[PDB]
Amino acid sequence: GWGNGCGFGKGGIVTCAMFRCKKNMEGKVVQPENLEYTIVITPHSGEE
């Protein structure tokens, strides 16, 4: 309206702010394949 520079009624307004992520989390998908098993094969000798 007149109080803020217009010749009264609703006007269009838009506001933007830069968004900066500071801490995120991530979810991953584990495929049955590409899984890696570690196996130890030890000789039963009794050595010390």
């Binding site: 007149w2 010749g7 009264f8 009624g9």
Partner: protein, 80 residues
Amino acid sequence: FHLTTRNGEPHMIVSRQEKGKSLLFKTEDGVNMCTLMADLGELCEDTITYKCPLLRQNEPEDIDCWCNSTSTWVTYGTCT
């Protein structure tokens, strides 16, 4: 603005570049000063037309157009 008439009464065709400025036009009864406070935009097909009442020492209420010497009709477009 273009000054014409509507049934003997003065009529103002107000264009976009007049938004915010006092509207003055001479009349037998002295100089008339209408005040336009209107959605006033560019003159186009979407016009609106209505009356600006005479207001003598009274504050305006529920209106955005008024003159102080002789009631006047006003017309302007809303386009942008």
